[PDB]
Amino acid sequence: MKLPIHFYKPLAAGAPQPIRELPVRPERVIHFFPPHVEKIRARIPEVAKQVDVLCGNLEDAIPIDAKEAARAGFIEVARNTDFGDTALWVRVNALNSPWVLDDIADIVATVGNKLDVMMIPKVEGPWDIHFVDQYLALLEAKHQIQKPILIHALLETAQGMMNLEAIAGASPRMHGFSLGPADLAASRGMKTTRVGGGHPFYGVLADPRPFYQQDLWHYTIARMVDVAVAHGLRAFYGPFGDIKDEAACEAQFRNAFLLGCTGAWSLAPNQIPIAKRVFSPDVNEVLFAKRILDAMPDGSGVAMIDGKMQDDATWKQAKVIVDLARMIAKKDPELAQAYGF
Amino acid sequence: MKLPIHFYKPLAAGAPQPIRELPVRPERVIHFFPPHVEKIRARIPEVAKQVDVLCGNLEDAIPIDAKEAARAGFIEVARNTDFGDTALWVRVNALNSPWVLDDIADIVATVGNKLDVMMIPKVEGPWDIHFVDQYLALLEAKHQIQKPILIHALLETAQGMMNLEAIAGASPRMHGFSLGPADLAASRGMKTTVGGGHPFYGVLADPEHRPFYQQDLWHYTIARMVDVAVAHGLRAFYGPFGDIKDEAACEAQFRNAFLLGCTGAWSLAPNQIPIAKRVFSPDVNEVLFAKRILDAMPDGSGVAMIDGKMQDDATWKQAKVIVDLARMIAKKDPELAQAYGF
Amino acid sequence: MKLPIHFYKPLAAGAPQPIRELPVRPERVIHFFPPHVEKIRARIPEVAKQVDVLCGNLEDAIPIDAKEAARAGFIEVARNTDFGDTALWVRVNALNSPWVLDDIADIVATVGNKLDVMMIPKVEGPWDIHFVDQYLALLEAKHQIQKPILIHALLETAQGMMNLEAIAGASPRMHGFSLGPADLAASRGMKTTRVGGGHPFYGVLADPQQEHRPFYQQDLWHYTIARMVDVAVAHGLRAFYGPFGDIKDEAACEAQFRNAFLLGCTGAWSLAPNQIPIAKRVFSPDVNEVLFAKRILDAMPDGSGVAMIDGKMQDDATWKQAKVIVDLARMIAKKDPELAQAYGF
Amino acid sequence: MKLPIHFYKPLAAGAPQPIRELPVRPERVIHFFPPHVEKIRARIPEVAKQVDVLCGNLEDAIPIDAKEAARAGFIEVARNTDFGDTALWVRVNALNSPWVLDDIADIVATVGNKLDVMMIPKVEGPWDIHFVDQYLALLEAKHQIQKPILIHALLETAQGMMNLEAIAGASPRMHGFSLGPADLAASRGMKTTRVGGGHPFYGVLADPQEHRPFYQQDLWHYTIARMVDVAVAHGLRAFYGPFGDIKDEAACEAQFRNAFLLGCTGAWSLAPNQIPIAKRVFSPDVNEVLFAKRILDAMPDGSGVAMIDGKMQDDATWKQAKVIVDLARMIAKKDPELAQAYGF
Amino acid sequence: MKLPIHFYKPLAAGAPQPIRELPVRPERVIHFFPPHVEKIRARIPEVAKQVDVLCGNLEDAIPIDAKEAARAGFIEVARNTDFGDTALWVRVNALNSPWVLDDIADIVATVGNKLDVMMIPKVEGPWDIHFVDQYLALLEAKHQIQKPILIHALLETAQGMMNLEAIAGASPRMHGFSLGPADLAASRGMKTTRGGGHPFYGVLADPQEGQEHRPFYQQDLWHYTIARMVDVAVAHGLRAFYGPFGDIKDEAACEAQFRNAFLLGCTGAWSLAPNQIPIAKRVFSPDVNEVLFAKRILDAMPDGSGVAMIDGKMQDDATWKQAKVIVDLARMIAKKDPELAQAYGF
């Protein structure tokens, strides 16, 4: 709705200048953790090094009794821990809840200069983003935050799916989208208690009899990807609830990856290597991106490579995945040999 | 879009207040009947006891010579019959046809207070909904109909599928959508094997014998329809399954629809009636696991693990959908109440 | 979007009257050829009769040094061949490239009266159509072109997919779309094997029962094609599967071509001679569809009134729809033995 | 951009249910005061009785170093005064400013149940309304405010004017608009200075024939007309803002009367002398009340169809008639002579 | 509408990067000249020093037999002259005419690096902008033009007036609009005595008892049009202009019409004759005494907030923001107008 002339203006005197390009960094796994449980908080600095992104959770799966405790716990661990190359996110409570006003406000007050991305659940339309963008801009000015805190929208209501284009366009803070398969099923009335992969009842019956199961989430992921990529945002697969079935987890993660998602959530330590292995950049795309960078050294002009003309749009897309691959190659030696770094 | 302040005002002075929420009733089976066949008219009291919804049909399969008879036939059944829990629908002729003006006018004038929903063939955009809304409101005012008759949009063309949002939002009479698979496939140029798949839609494995995995032609259509319909507070329906001979395939196509969020389906023949009632009811084992989820977090908030599956607020709301539907369905069917918890 | 009353006016004083409905002619196969290669130019009058459409390529796989060569070879082979019933297309270079201005200007000024469709690569929004539409009008006015050159849009970016409705509605020149799997895969960050068009590791794992869990492969392109068909058909346009890049695998090419036909695509490209008979086999009209359409034409001898066939009401609109199926079956049955023997004329 | 099925749902569990219609009450004069001036805070209990609406000011005209004092002054007055039938409004600071977060939070927490309408300056687009709407909802839930605080949008920017339709429809909290002539002139680059009147060099020169006469024109005709149309179409009220030249009561009256003739509901008053000018100008026309009483008489059950003087009457006109009669009866409660003319 | 992430990217490989905000220069007068007349070309170097903007005209009042000579004539004068502080514009022919393709192509190829703004007649909707944007960008990449040439839209139809928001938003090349009053009145079916107005447009006073004749108050035809043009332009970051005042000889009527456009928020106006140049520069310059007074508003409130009383007139934050607009224009014009640099001081 906002005209480009005004789109990148900060929304408060003293707020950091809005971002023009989303920051490039590894986002292969987003590891949730319950911040009100002490034993988990103690292992967090060691866990922090095993993940690309660490995300404190304050909304779903936190008992109502523990809401205030999860907030203090998140501020506590974020205070004392240096997260190095790992990104730090938090999922706050829904915008109609009694906790979201103090959630956002105190987290910016105490750890704002360490928060990279704030995850907003149950987004229904661009108005939700409009609130959070202005609220953040004012808190950023009050507490003198240096970097703009980005917005990450959880895509888990039927209205969010309908309003997807408007949500993606609602703010220069937008980082991307996470599909929430359980909430989105409840919202749509999909008839399943599952959080993730296939369903035995969803299939095609052969003619006279073999039964071929079908992907429940094809339309949903394809739609999320197309809208995200068109806005320069990133799409993510959210939770896979069957923590034990690592094969089904890998199959679901890889499906998201093959349609174009950047990473996936992990709800338990054992899903962390699954997300890292599935969402690692494809070797042959990195290697082709390096030819593009080599063909257009300063990023301008026209070049061909294998009968295909390279432009400014391909150079910037190539530049993103090579920078990302270098950052991955710096944490894992086996990948560094595969990308050539 | 009509501004919300003008959206809920009635369109004719003396026509009833527009609703702001739909009624709550099982709509698992929409059973059609030709009102011009007296034998079929004679058996309507008995059939009414077996179906959630009875839809008089004035459109497809009613010969040109039978139209006046079918319209008078419908009025006579609706007059004479007590339906009770069964909703009474009518599918009138298409908006460009020489019968629709009298279809709606004669039916409202006589049995307007007994009609729940009017189904409109071939809805192509919001203008179709605006005509019917305004016509209905003028007729309801003239015969002082007490409750507003609802509009059910039949999805039969590519233009209608592309205007699905504007159709869904065009009136507070909107009740929901039915997919007309044969007619929609004909409009798109799809090739099917009436209202079902086609065995040659699949993907070939990589290069002995080379496996072939069939796909569902209707995934995009159904998913888009449920998204639009639910976002607006409406319901989606699978329409006609034309392969009456093949009942394994009819139950398979119905269960897919049910899983994606469709509410019910059409029965074109008496054998489809029990299939549609069983498939658009929750599975027993699925009601049972969902009752385990509701138990593990009575406040609906927190975390739990069942059979190695994580549960939270979101799965609690999944179980509430499943359990509440089974509860409502079980009040009407006392036999399924015994396969759940009564 | 322009108002209906301005939508059908010519955009230049001297340009031909825009068309109100698409020309009805066979488009089962779209055969590409590099117009700079001399030996290819020499056998073009013969390949012309094996294909429904001949499309000159000036863009991908044409070297930078051959750009003026391909453009000039196209102009020469287009002025000298009589194509008979075959349609003549050309794919120009992208709208951001150093070659498209002379591509369009030289072709319209030499062979414009011979060109049926111009294909634009990488159409990302309505603005692209607006540039081509106005550019073509000015050129057609200058060179007294009698009939409008239509525009065919190549889908290769997530942005193009998101703007599909606006693109379809941006001009009466709009002919249809072609999906370009490999480039659109790259635009979205999809993973495909074999030059676009698939991935064997996209699939649904069965529940546990046995240690072997069945794995059901899925189609990566279902959303894309279904969306393409709805937007194309709602505007009166046609949808096509573009380049199937694995030329050596004829089983898989037939499978991919058939999925597109079953979902409602009109034709597909061919990159090599072995794909020409595959496209023509798969995209031949369904016989039952034509039989029904003929009954409509019979029941209403002059497309007036209201009739009913197999319980289905028919009107002037169905009648104009049956006439398009029947006229197209007759054109295709001229070149197709099995349709000629299945349905006749 | 919200669907009617969700437009009228509260934005927080606990926040009061949103209005479907606007409160009917006299709104002929919006009287502004600086709440940081102690001599003004002392006279508020008497000023309240003389005005329809009293609006505290925290934005323009309040110095930067008085901001925190204006806010605390406003809360002191509001806690300690019974406004009776007078409505209580606040104009808070702009949404990009260091004061607006505590402005809204503190006022809601302490005097939320006495606050009728919140004025938001320098509105540019529906996104401003979305922010205030959701923010108000959460605060109202926290402090259990019992009716929803409404939102009044100040037209002070060319962006706001271009986005007027979208602003009007952005929330069921919307109460209406006020034209802010000085700020709007600056935003457009209108080359005038005076807050709210004519300009002597804006006019039409006659064709040559001795001396060519010069007919002055209204600068604000398009602006007010567009504001009234958008506002009425949305069931909202439009207001003329401040008239600056306090001493020139005739130019005040004519500018106020122009807004009244185009469809505005009331006007601001900056100084005690403007109070009786706004109340006289913006009272309903006698004929408008009289005609509205007959519509109310032709249809005792406000449904069905009635024809009055050649013209048919439905439920929208019965409802616009009941608003103006209720308004007129309330204006008679405190005006003897208008009571006899209105027929009460 | 193009999305912001894509709005600011170039439309051709090697085209100069889109600007994010318009250049700030004085645009009080847009002086038109017919480039096929030799006597006019000879004196351009001198007249270019007298005008804020110089605009070569290929369209109206350029005969059909003279089109090519006017186009080549414009290239000859642009190549030779050094224009200094004076912006150089050109009005090409309409997008439907047989001359516009070469108009645009030839001029960018030769004098592209000197052209600031290209003015397009009869812009009816955003699609016209899209054509000119893509066409320029290819030409700019072909001939390596260093900075983007801007687009000025001339409004001559009811369609363009109705499509004004979409036109304003269609490209980062967008500069502004000029009203074409005679063409716009003709498209709408308005009747005007000269663009101009019409003395018979007015309000009849009711009869008074002793009057011979009822007074007749003349009204302005163009109020809604100009007011709509300023709101849409300013909201998008662009600038609105009065176009041609065809009645060249009635200097007093010219001054009053321009003044009305100025007070509502127009930046400047066209001049079709040397006698209109001083009028446009004077009407679209802030009044000296108003600038002088605005300096006193700014100093009375250094923080720009609160109140102040200056010469018995009340001042507040809003008046301060008016003063800043009026002072900021005066300061920028003083860098171009040597006698107003005196009268303004600073």
mmCIF file with all atom_site columns, C-alpha atoms in Angstrom, chain B residues 194-271:
data_model
loop_
_atom_site.group_PDB
_atom_site.id
_atom_site.type_symbol
_atom_site.label_atom_id
_atom_site.label_alt_id
_atom_site.label_comp_id
_atom_site.label_asym_id
_atom_site.label_entity_id
_atom_site.label_seq_id
_atom_site.pdbx_PDB_ins_code
_atom_site.Cartn_x
_atom_site.Cartn_y
_atom_site.Cartn_z
_atom_site.occupancy
_atom_site.B_iso_or_equiv
_atom_site.pdbx_formal_charge
_atom_site.auth_seq_id
_atom_site.auth_comp_id
_atom_site.auth_asym_id
_atom_site.auth_atom_id
_atom_site.pdbx_PDB_model_num
ATOM 1  C CA . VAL B 1 194 ? -17.139 -37.740 -14.804 1.00 0.00 ? 194 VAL B CA 1
ATOM 2  C CA . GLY B 1 195 ? -15.852 -35.573 -11.923 1.00 0.00 ? 195 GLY B CA 1
ATOM 3  C CA . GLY B 1 196 ? -12.802 -37.677 -11.097 1.00 0.00 ? 196 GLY B CA 1
ATOM 4  C CA . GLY B 1 197 ? -9.153  -38.198 -12.017 1.00 0.00 ? 197 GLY B CA 1
ATOM 5  C CA . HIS B 1 198 ? -7.416  -39.707 -15.071 1.00 0.00 ? 198 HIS B CA 1
ATOM 6  C CA . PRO B 1 199 ? -4.997  -42.666 -14.833 1.00 0.00 ? 199 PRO B CA 1
ATOM 7  C CA . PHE B 1 200 ? -2.385  -41.086 -17.099 1.00 0.00 ? 200 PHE B CA 1
ATOM 8  C CA . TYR B 1 201 ? -1.706  -38.074 -14.855 1.00 0.00 ? 201 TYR B CA 1
ATOM 9  C CA . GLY B 1 202 ? 1.454   -39.122 -13.052 1.00 0.00 ? 202 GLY B CA 1
ATOM 10 C CA . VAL B 1 203 ? 5.220   -38.856 -12.920 1.00 0.00 ? 203 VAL B CA 1
ATOM 11 C CA . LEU B 1 204 ? 7.661   -41.380 -14.416 1.00 0.00 ? 204 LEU B CA 1
ATOM 12 C CA . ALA B 1 205 ? 10.549  -42.674 -12.324 1.00 0.00 ? 205 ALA B CA 1
ATOM 13 C CA . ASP B 1 206 ? 14.137  -42.217 -13.481 1.00 0.00 ? 206 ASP B CA 1
ATOM 14 C CA . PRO B 1 207 ? 15.384  -44.641 -16.204 1.00 0.00 ? 207 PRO B CA 1
ATOM 15 C CA . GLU B 1 208 ? 13.827  -52.778 -17.188 1.00 0.00 ? 208 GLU B CA 1
ATOM 16 C CA . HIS B 1 209 ? 10.379  -51.659 -15.960 1.00 0.00 ? 209 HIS B CA 1
ATOM 17 C CA . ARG B 1 210 ? 9.900   -47.986 -15.032 1.00 0.00 ? 210 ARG B CA 1
ATOM 18 C CA . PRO B 1 211 ? 7.405   -47.146 -12.247 1.00 0.00 ? 211 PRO B CA 1
ATOM 19 C CA . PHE B 1 212 ? 4.683   -44.534 -12.706 1.00 0.00 ? 212 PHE B CA 1
ATOM 20 C CA . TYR B 1 213 ? 3.228   -42.615 -9.736  1.00 0.00 ? 213 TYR B CA 1
ATOM 21 C CA . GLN B 1 214 ? -0.270  -41.252 -10.355 1.00 0.00 ? 214 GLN B CA 1
ATOM 22 C CA . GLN B 1 215 ? -1.205  -37.738 -9.217  1.00 0.00 ? 215 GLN B CA 1
ATOM 23 C CA . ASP B 1 216 ? -4.463  -35.997 -8.251  1.00 0.00 ? 216 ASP B CA 1
ATOM 24 C CA . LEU B 1 217 ? -5.626  -33.503 -10.905 1.00 0.00 ? 217 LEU B CA 1
ATOM 25 C CA . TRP B 1 218 ? -7.813  -31.694 -8.326  1.00 0.00 ? 218 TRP B CA 1
ATOM 26 C CA . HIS B 1 219 ? -5.264  -30.717 -5.664  1.00 0.00 ? 219 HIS B CA 1
ATOM 27 C CA . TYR B 1 220 ? -4.945  -27.079 -6.791  1.00 0.00 ? 220 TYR B CA 1
ATOM 28 C CA . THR B 1 221 ? -8.685  -26.637 -7.351  1.00 0.00 ? 221 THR B CA 1
ATOM 29 C CA . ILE B 1 222 ? -9.827  -27.968 -3.978  1.00 0.00 ? 222 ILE B CA 1
ATOM 30 C CA . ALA B 1 223 ? -7.077  -26.294 -1.951  1.00 0.00 ? 223 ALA B CA 1
ATOM 31 C CA . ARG B 1 224 ? -7.743  -22.882 -3.482  1.00 0.00 ? 224 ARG B CA 1
ATOM 32 C CA . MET B 1 225 ? -11.489 -23.293 -2.933  1.00 0.00 ? 225 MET B CA 1
ATOM 33 C CA . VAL B 1 226 ? -11.165 -24.204 0.769   1.00 0.00 ? 226 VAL B CA 1
ATOM 34 C CA . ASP B 1 227 ? -8.753  -21.337 1.487   1.00 0.00 ? 227 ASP B CA 1
ATOM 35 C CA . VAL B 1 228 ? -11.082 -18.709 -0.053  1.00 0.00 ? 228 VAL B CA 1
ATOM 36 C CA . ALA B 1 229 ? -14.243 -20.214 1.444   1.00 0.00 ? 229 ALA B CA 1
ATOM 37 C CA . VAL B 1 230 ? -12.954 -20.596 5.004   1.00 0.00 ? 230 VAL B CA 1
ATOM 38 C CA . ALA B 1 231 ? -11.312 -17.167 5.067   1.00 0.00 ? 231 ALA B CA 1
ATOM 39 C CA . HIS B 1 232 ? -14.787 -15.707 4.398   1.00 0.00 ? 232 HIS B CA 1
ATOM 40 C CA . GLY B 1 233 ? -16.665 -17.854 6.911   1.00 0.00 ? 233 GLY B CA 1
ATOM 41 C CA . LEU B 1 234 ? -18.111 -20.100 4.185   1.00 0.00 ? 234 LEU B CA 1
ATOM 42 C CA . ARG B 1 235 ? -18.068 -23.827 3.442   1.00 0.00 ? 235 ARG B CA 1
ATOM 43 C CA . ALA B 1 236 ? -16.687 -25.753 0.459   1.00 0.00 ? 236 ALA B CA 1
ATOM 44 C CA . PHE B 1 237 ? -18.376 -28.771 -1.107  1.00 0.00 ? 237 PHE B CA 1
ATOM 45 C CA . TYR B 1 238 ? -17.303 -31.443 -3.511  1.00 0.00 ? 238 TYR B CA 1
ATOM 46 C CA . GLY B 1 239 ? -19.975 -31.600 -6.179  1.00 0.00 ? 239 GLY B CA 1
ATOM 47 C CA . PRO B 1 240 ? -21.056 -34.552 -8.329  1.00 0.00 ? 240 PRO B CA 1
ATOM 48 C CA . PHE B 1 241 ? -19.090 -37.788 -8.662  1.00 0.00 ? 241 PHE B CA 1
ATOM 49 C CA . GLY B 1 242 ? -20.463 -39.124 -11.949 1.00 0.00 ? 242 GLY B CA 1
ATOM 50 C CA . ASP B 1 243 ? -19.027 -42.649 -11.794 1.00 0.00 ? 243 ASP B CA 1
ATOM 51 C CA . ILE B 1 244 ? -21.965 -44.269 -10.020 1.00 0.00 ? 244 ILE B CA 1
ATOM 52 C CA . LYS B 1 245 ? -20.752 -47.795 -10.863 1.00 0.00 ? 245 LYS B CA 1
ATOM 53 C CA . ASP B 1 246 ? -17.329 -47.371 -9.160  1.00 0.00 ? 246 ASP B CA 1
ATOM 54 C CA . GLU B 1 247 ? -17.888 -46.902 -5.426  1.00 0.00 ? 247 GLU B CA 1
ATOM 55 C CA . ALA B 1 248 ? -14.311 -47.505 -4.280  1.00 0.00 ? 248 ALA B CA 1
ATOM 56 C CA . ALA B 1 249 ? -13.233 -44.515 -6.377  1.00 0.00 ? 249 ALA B CA 1
ATOM 57 C CA . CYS B 1 250 ? -16.139 -42.388 -5.179  1.00 0.00 ? 250 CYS B CA 1
ATOM 58 C CA . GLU B 1 251 ? -15.182 -42.973 -1.557  1.00 0.00 ? 251 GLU B CA 1
ATOM 59 C CA . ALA B 1 252 ? -11.527 -42.189 -2.323  1.00 0.00 ? 252 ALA B CA 1
ATOM 60 C CA . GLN B 1 253 ? -12.290 -38.884 -4.047  1.00 0.00 ? 253 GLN B CA 1
ATOM 61 C CA . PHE B 1 254 ? -14.708 -37.952 -1.252  1.00 0.00 ? 254 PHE B CA 1
ATOM 62 C CA . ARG B 1 255 ? -12.144 -38.608 1.506   1.00 0.00 ? 255 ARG B CA 1
ATOM 63 C CA . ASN B 1 256 ? -9.534  -36.427 -0.189  1.00 0.00 ? 256 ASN B CA 1
ATOM 64 C CA . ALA B 1 257 ? -12.068 -33.595 -0.335  1.00 0.00 ? 257 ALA B CA 1
ATOM 65 C CA . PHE B 1 258 ? -12.882 -34.190 3.339   1.00 0.00 ? 258 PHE B CA 1
ATOM 66 C CA . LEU B 1 259 ? -9.238  -34.145 4.355   1.00 0.00 ? 259 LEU B CA 1
ATOM 67 C CA . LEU B 1 260 ? -8.512  -30.802 2.667   1.00 0.00 ? 260 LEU B CA 1
ATOM 68 C CA . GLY B 1 261 ? -11.473 -29.175 4.451   1.00 0.00 ? 261 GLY B CA 1
ATOM 69 C CA . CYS B 1 262 ? -14.582 -29.814 2.345   1.00 0.00 ? 262 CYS B CA 1
ATOM 70 C CA . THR B 1 263 ? -17.802 -30.153 4.354   1.00 0.00 ? 263 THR B CA 1
ATOM 71 C CA . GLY B 1 264 ? -19.775 -32.591 2.219   1.00 0.00 ? 264 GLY B CA 1
ATOM 72 C CA . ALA B 1 265 ? -20.509 -33.893 -1.259  1.00 0.00 ? 265 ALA B CA 1
ATOM 73 C CA . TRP B 1 266 ? -23.340 -34.551 -3.698  1.00 0.00 ? 266 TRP B CA 1
ATOM 74 C CA . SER B 1 267 ? -25.059 -37.931 -3.990  1.00 0.00 ? 267 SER B CA 1
ATOM 75 C CA . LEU B 1 268 ? -26.374 -38.496 -7.521  1.00 0.00 ? 268 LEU B CA 1
ATOM 76 C CA . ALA B 1 269 ? -27.771 -41.957 -6.680  1.00 0.00 ? 269 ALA B CA 1
ATOM 77 C CA . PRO B 1 270 ? -28.971 -43.729 -3.508  1.00 0.00 ? 270 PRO B CA 1
ATOM 78 C CA . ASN B 1 271 ? -25.787 -45.813 -3.087  1.00 0.00 ? 271 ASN B CA 1
#
